[PDB]
């Protein structure tokens, strides 16, 4: 007789960028789920059990939806610029320039979609790069945003190949 599951089908927080120290900044995600390594801004991650199933299992596949959430440090009437996300196939040396969005930071919320995988079908934890779709967040004026968050719900189709443990 099991009790209520902790988390419902609502989204869960995935990564949050804050303390931007250098303006006109970009952050690169790519097809990988984690390992962003942003050097001009601090990043934080979730404790949630899904990101734990990503670290335990060897290969993981799927597509996961997104949202963006942010707030403004400056005055709302002094606001300017945008937060964009850029979506390519392959890395920007070559690419096809797929669907990309430019949100003005006066809107304060945006929603998009991301694929984790490859042509081979699945992407593991220790990094290599195999041809797949590549997503990068670009900030026109960075100092405006005090805190940014992105929370992601995976679409029903998802998978985990392999079984392992992660000693941290």
């Amino acid at each position, epitope marked *: 007789d099991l009790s209520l599951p902790s988390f419902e089908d609502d989204y869960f927080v995935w990564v949050d960028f804050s*303390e931007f*120290t250098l303006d006109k900044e970009e952050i690169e995600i790519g097809s990988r789920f*984690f*390992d*962003f*390594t*942003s*050097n001009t801004c*601090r*990043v*934080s*991650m*979730g*404790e949630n059990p899904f*990101a*734990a199933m990503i*670290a335990c299992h060897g290969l993981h596949s799927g597509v996961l939806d997104l949202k963006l959430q942010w707030s403004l440090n400056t005055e709302f009437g002094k606001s300017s610029g945008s937060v964009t996300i850029t979506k390519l196939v392959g890395d920007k040396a070559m690419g096809l320039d797929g669907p990309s969005h430019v949100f003005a930071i006066q809107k304060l919320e945006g929603t998009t979609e991301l694929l984790v995988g490859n042509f081979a079908g699945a992407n593991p934890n220790t990094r290599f790069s195999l041809y797949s779709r590549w997503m990068a967040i670009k900030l026109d004026q960075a100092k405006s945003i005090k805190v940014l968050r992105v929370l992601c719900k995976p679409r029903p189709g998802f998978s985990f190949y392999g079984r392992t443990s*992660f000693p*941290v």
Partner: nanobody
Amino acid sequence: QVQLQESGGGSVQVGGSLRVACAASGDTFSGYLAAWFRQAPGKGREGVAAINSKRHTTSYADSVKGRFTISKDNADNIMYLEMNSLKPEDTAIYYCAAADAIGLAEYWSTPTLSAARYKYWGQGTQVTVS
């Protein structure tokens, strides 16, 4: 579990570089995420740079970039603070303090600078300039 012994602080001219002594290992690991700390008279425990050593991720403090560095020797495998250039106001004694309970949320993230997380605290070495 953790021993710490440090020296190498002293007065210097502006633009000077003070290397800080290799952190003494204790109890045969010395792999824990460890961050330096500073003080000011009347102002306690502002953070300074740190490294997540195993992932080779660097973290620096606000108000400082490039004049404090933190690196790990590949052969010695023991962290030490490096300071290549110095502004007049380094008033405090620096502190070396490590945390060994790292989970999965403190691993892929940037190393935290909060003082309340680090459970191993030691005296540290006195540094100042005229």
